[PDB]
Amino acid sequence: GVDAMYCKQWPECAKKMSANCICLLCLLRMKHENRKLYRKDPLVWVDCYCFDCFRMWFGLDLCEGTLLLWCDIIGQTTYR
Amino acid sequence: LYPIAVLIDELRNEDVQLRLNSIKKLSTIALALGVERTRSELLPFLTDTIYDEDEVLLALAEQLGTFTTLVGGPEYVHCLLPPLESLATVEETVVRDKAVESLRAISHEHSPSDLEAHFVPLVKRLAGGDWFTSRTSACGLFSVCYPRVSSAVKAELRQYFRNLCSDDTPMVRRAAASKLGEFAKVLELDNVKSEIIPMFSNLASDEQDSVRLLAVEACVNIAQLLPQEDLEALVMPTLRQAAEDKSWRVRYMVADKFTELQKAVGPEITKTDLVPAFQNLMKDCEAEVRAAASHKVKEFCENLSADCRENVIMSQILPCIKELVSDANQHVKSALASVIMGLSPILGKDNTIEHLLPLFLAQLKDECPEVRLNIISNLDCVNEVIGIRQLSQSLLPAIVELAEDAKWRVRLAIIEYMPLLAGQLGVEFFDEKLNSLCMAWLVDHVYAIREAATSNLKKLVEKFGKEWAHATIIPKVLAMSGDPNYLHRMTTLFCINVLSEVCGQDITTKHMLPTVLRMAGDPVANVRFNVAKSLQKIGPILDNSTLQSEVKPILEKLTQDQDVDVKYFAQEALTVLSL
Ligand SMILES: [Zn+2]
Ligand SMILES: [Zn+2]
């Protein structure tokens, strides 16, 4: 299901609403931002695992449907 | 120049909110600088400069929209090509969205030589670029130039539009697909057959369901550009695959645009291919599709082959339907219940009676109001098909049970039909077990309902005559002015308010005007503040005689009641009747 690990409080985290969060979704975005300072090029689902790069790679809208998918992938990936 | 050291201070401007009010008016600045100055240092500035916030950029690219003239006209328009090719590459879409909008716009303002000269080159620059954005922003620039270049350029564009449909980044492939639509329209058959189609296919089968999806969307327009002969050979295999597609989202596409395809395809391919498909859609695993299918039912049947219609419907469609009525999803049910009554002037009296009433009836009783609702709305019809007597020995019952439906809408629904219904059934019939029904509503928990019920009488009278009113309605109404519940006595004064409109002078004056004046002495001030309003209402109907005789008299005494509201109205009456 949806661990408070992948994403705490849905609607929000997905759009920087929860403060000082510690969910991958939140954290992974940060990598994204951070990572985008030293670089100018646009980030893409391959190189980034952030929730948004994901959505854009498969052109999926912001909804729990898409949140679940993203998780399955972040899961298969974190587990070998 | 002049404002080339003035606008700069206006830009570097400490705050950002004014750089909006600056670019927004970057046309009165092109007016200022000559068409030789606007393009002299004004455009070469807005280029290697301006890095502001995305909204400022939106402003710039928008403004660079209307400009084809403020720098010359179709002779120089190609001087706007470099400042966009920059905007159409920013990462925030909203921005490059516009830019490409402008690009496309001023494209028309080019010259055949102008296009193959600078435009088309930029189209290869964007499409070849590193950043997927650019290639995406490119996709929307082929449909415009191509139509007006050389058969050699066309040879390139197409070639280019192809590498896009296969781009590594789905973003772009989706882009190209979302653009396979129009770009196919500007091509000439030969191509569209030996190019669009192939692209249309690959794309309809791309790895990403989010793209095959965008492919199918294209289908209709494509098929709308090929004579029947070929469709069986080009569109069908694909379209066929679509209906089956792994992604419900795609099947949904097919489902939703099903009618459109019908008219796109042809009338025979329809039963040869679509009809079988339609059946599986209606049987589809994902409700969101079953539903999207059910809506298409009626129209699909209507636009079937003038002949085989009755056949296919009964042999193919009809059975699925009967299964849909019992669907689990409150929606599919609901959807279908809306369009299902439409299969009558299409099927037939008997057929309908044997095959559809049970359906309708099944629905008339559904636990869902959106359904009960949807079925009630189309009844007025079927009564045309099956006999009026048939209606009364099958549905009349449900309908009555419906009139005491839990939900006010459903009730309301029954009420607005009643007038039409009675009409058809005949006055004598109504008089029996319909009258009573129409009167109960005058006491429904919900106002909207009572109000409607009241109008219903008026309507009912109009359909049955004041004589009828007089011996069937008027009574029960006046009698209701006895009920201890003060609210009801009001309802009574209201009916009078309504009926008077259609019962004519001689009847208002001897059966209502009285009861109205009498209640003007009700222990409950409300009944009385209304009784005035009423004598005001049923005023003009009366005759100057009866008025000043009983109206004005026992209306004056009213201006002397306690409760201000009573007064407020009591005299307001006298202020219209001239007293
Ligand atoms: Zn979070
Ligand atoms: Zn990312």
Side-chain angles (χ1 to χ4, degrees):
Chain A
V2 176
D3 287 79
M5 179 147 275
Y6 294 86
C7 176
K8 188 191 61 178
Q9 273 302 305
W10 166 230
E12 283 80 24
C13 281
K15 29 166 61 179
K16 286 194 165 193
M17 299 263 86
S18 61
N20 303 313
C21 188
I22 296 160
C23 72
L24 294 69
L25 174 21
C26 273
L27 283 167
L28 277 169
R29 174 175 49 228
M30 187 188 89
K31 199 175 174 65
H32 191 110
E33 316 187 302
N34 191 77
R35 206 266 211 55
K36 193 182 170 185
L37 295 169
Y38 217 157
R39 185 205 276 215
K40 294 181 187 178
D41 256 42
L43 283 181
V44 171
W45 179 241
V46 182
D47 315 312
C48 200
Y49 281 84
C50 85
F51 185 60
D52 302 324
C53 278
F54 175 55
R55 290 172 53 200
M56 184 154 64
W57 187 264
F58 302 95
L60 300 184
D61 351 64
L62 180 128
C63 69
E64 308 189 312
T66 306
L67 172 60
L68 295 149
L69 291 184
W70 179 70
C71 283
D72 294 333
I73 303 295
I74 296 304
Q76 298 177 41
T77 300
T78 50
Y79 297 160
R80 182 75 281 183
Chain B
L1 298 177
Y2 161 52
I4 204 62
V6 177
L7 163 56
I8 282 184
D9 294 303
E10 300 168 59
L11 299 183
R12 64 160 68 183
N13 190 303
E14 290 69 291
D15 184 55
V16 186
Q17 190 68 59
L18 286 62
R19 282 201 302 301
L20 180 161
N21 288 288
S22 180
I23 297 296
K24 263 288 182 179
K25 193 170 169 58
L26 176 61
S27 63
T28 57
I29 280 60
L31 230 303
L33 289 300
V35 301
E36 268 289 53
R37 291 217 283 183
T38 306
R39 70 176 200 66
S40 73
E41 212 202 310
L42 179 56
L43 287 187
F45 176 66
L46 307 177
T47 304
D48 58 70
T49 315
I50 301 179
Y51 56 80
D52 316 303
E53 303 209 312
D54 296 293
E55 178 181 52
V56 183
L57 294 167
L58 183 49
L60 168 49
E62 178 201 68
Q63 193 49 289
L64 269 175
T66 44
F67 242 63
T68 47
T69 180
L70 278 57
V71 67
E75 255 242 13
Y76 287 74
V77 74
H78 66 87
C79 291
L80 299 152
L81 289 229
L84 290 191
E85 184 179 310
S86 172
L87 280 154
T89 301
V90 191
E91 201 165 315
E92 244 309 303
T93 62
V94 198
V95 160
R96 61 171 189 277
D97 272 38
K98 260 297 171 295
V100 188
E101 182 181 52
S102 298
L103 270 177
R104 303 185 67 184
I106 71 172
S107 76
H108 299 58
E109 295 299 6
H110 268 272
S111 73
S113 302
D114 282 329
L115 293 191
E116 302 176 54
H118 301 93
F119 208 71
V120 164
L122 147 153
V123 176
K124 292 188 178 189
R125 286 207 286 288
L126 291 174
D130 308 287
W131 301 8
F132 79 66
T133 49
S134 317
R135 285 122 70 200
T136 257
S137 253
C139 290
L141 302 175
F142 293 49
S143 195
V144 269
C145 74
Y146 190 96
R148 325 181 311 164
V149 295
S150 61
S151 302
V153 168
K154 287 189 174 181
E156 300 179 307
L157 295 177
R158 301 197 311 263
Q159 186 71 68
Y160 259 97
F161 188 90
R162 177 177 297 129
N163 303 304
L164 301 175
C165 301
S166 333
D167 188 287
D168 314 53
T169 6
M171 6 264 84
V172 180
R173 286 203 304 286
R174 288 207 293 279
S178 61
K179 288 304 184 306
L180 194 64
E182 59 177 335
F183 186 59
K185 293 182 171 183
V186 290
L187 303 194
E188 35 288 311
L189 278 295
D190 272 6
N191 299 293
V192 174
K193 280 184 188 169
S194 53
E195 267 133 353
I196 289 299
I197 296 288
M199 284 188 272
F200 165 75
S201 170
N202 299 178
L203 278 159
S205 0
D206 183 286
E207 175 172 36
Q208 259 55 51
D209 49 312
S210 61
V211 195
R212 308 200 301 286
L213 180 165
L214 255 299
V216 178
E217 171 77 20
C219 192
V220 173
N221 311 58
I222 293 184
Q224 287 179 296
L225 296 159
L226 308 172
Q228 193 280 74
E229 298 86 284
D230 299 285
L231 303 184
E232 170 50 70
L234 292 179
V235 178
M236 293 328 281
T238 299
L239 181 63
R240 241 172 287 180
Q241 180 46 46
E244 284 181 54
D245 202 295
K246 236 183 193 291
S247 177
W248 67 276
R249 287 179 180 78
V250 177
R251 308 208 291 293
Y252 181 87
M253 249 313 314
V254 195
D256 205 69
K257 306 241 169 193
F258 214 65
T259 65
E260 306 178 57
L261 288 178
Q262 209 178 200
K263 178 187 170 190
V265 195
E268 205 190 74
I269 321 76
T270 302
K271 183 191 177 178
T272 301
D273 283 297
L274 298 187
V275 179
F278 191 28
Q279 286 176 287
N280 300 56
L281 284 171
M282 308 190 246
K283 293 192 198 290
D284 195 296
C285 350
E286 274 295 329
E288 202 108 66
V289 167
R290 279 201 293 296
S294 311
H295 279 94
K296 293 316 186 81
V297 182
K298 173 192 178 189
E299 186 178 44
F300 184 58
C301 298
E302 285 168 289
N303 295 303
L304 245 167
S305 296
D307 43 72
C308 76
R309 181 186 300 184
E310 191 170 60
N311 260 55
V312 288
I313 290 186
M314 206 74 71
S315 51
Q316 313 313 312
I317 293 68
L318 189 63
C320 284
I321 295 187
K322 201 175 182 184
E323 243 296 304
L324 284 172
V325 190
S326 307
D327 202 287
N329 224 50
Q330 308 274 285
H331 297 160
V332 176
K333 265 195 286 181
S334 204
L336 185 65
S338 77
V339 300
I340 197 166
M341 304 270 194
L343 291 170
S344 287
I346 206 172
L347 281 185
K349 181 172 190 170
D350 303 300
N351 284 291
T352 294
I353 316 182
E354 183 171 3
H355 307 295
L356 302 182
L357 280 62
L359 292 174
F360 304 167
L361 232 321
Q363 308 198 289
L364 269 319
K365 293 172 187 172
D366 199 274
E367 287 185 358
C368 166
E370 255 288 304
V371 161
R372 268 174 286 171
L373 218 179
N374 279 21
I375 270 293
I376 305 181
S377 178
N378 290 300
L379 295 179
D380 330 3
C381 168
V382 312
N383 166 66
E384 290 283 291
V385 167
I386 92 181
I388 168 56
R389 97 167 180 65
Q390 240 304 160
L391 186 57
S392 58
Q393 191 174 53
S394 314
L395 279 43
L396 198 304
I399 279 167
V400 183
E401 209 173 85
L402 254 329
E404 292 215 315
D405 191 277
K407 304 301 199 173
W408 67 265
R409 259 253 65 175
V410 178
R411 288 202 277 312
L412 176 40
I414 290 299
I415 298 182
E416 305 197 67
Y417 175 38
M418 192 75 279
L420 216 209
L421 213 193
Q424 291 143 307
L425 280 173
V427 53
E428 61 320 89
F429 191 124
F430 180 90
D431 279 14
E432 190 170 297
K433 269 296 189 176
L434 243 55
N435 171 136
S436 68
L437 219 56
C438 304
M439 292 282 89
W441 293 327
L442 282 303
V443 178
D444 198 76
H445 288 64
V446 28
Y447 168 113
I449 287 293
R450 297 201 310 278
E451 207 66 64
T454 309
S455 208
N456 182 226
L457 306 210
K458 177 200 158 196
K459 301 292 252 72
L460 271 176
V461 169
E462 307 197 297
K463 187 93 72 168
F464 294 146
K466 68 191 180 186
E467 349 290 320
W468 178 74
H470 173 295
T472 284
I473 309 296
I474 305 285
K476 301 193 167 193
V477 155
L478 292 192
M480 185 174 278
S481 66
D483 190 330
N485 184 323
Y486 76 117
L487 287 163
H488 296 336
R489 262 120 55 185
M490 287 179 261
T491 297
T492 308
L493 289 185
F494 297 169
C495 289
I496 293 184
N497 279 116
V498 165
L499 294 284
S500 66
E501 280 186 305
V502 300
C503 284
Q505 194 171 66
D506 271 312
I507 300 188
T508 314
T509 308
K510 179 156 281 189
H511 283 282
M512 310 183 300
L513 178 47
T515 313
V516 178
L517 299 169
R518 186 180 69 56
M519 292 171 76
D522 197 309
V524 181
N526 281 65
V527 185
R528 299 166 300 186
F529 93 65
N530 272 307
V531 67
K533 310 174 63 182
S534 303
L535 299 173
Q536 162 173 24
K537 174 61 177 180
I538 70 180
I541 293 182
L542 304 175
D543 41 53
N544 288 68
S545 170
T546 302
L547 202 165
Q548 294 164 52
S549 184
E550 300 185 302
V551 171
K552 180 172 192 172
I554 206 158
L555 198 178
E556 310 298 53
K557 183 173 65 178
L558 294 173
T559 56
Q560 294 186 311
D561 198 13
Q562 196 298 302
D563 193 292
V564 181
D565 284 301
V566 176
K567 193 177 301 178
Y568 192 155
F569 286 119
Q571 190 161 168
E572 186 77 15
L574 312 166
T575 310
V576 186
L577 318 171
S578 302
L579 308 176

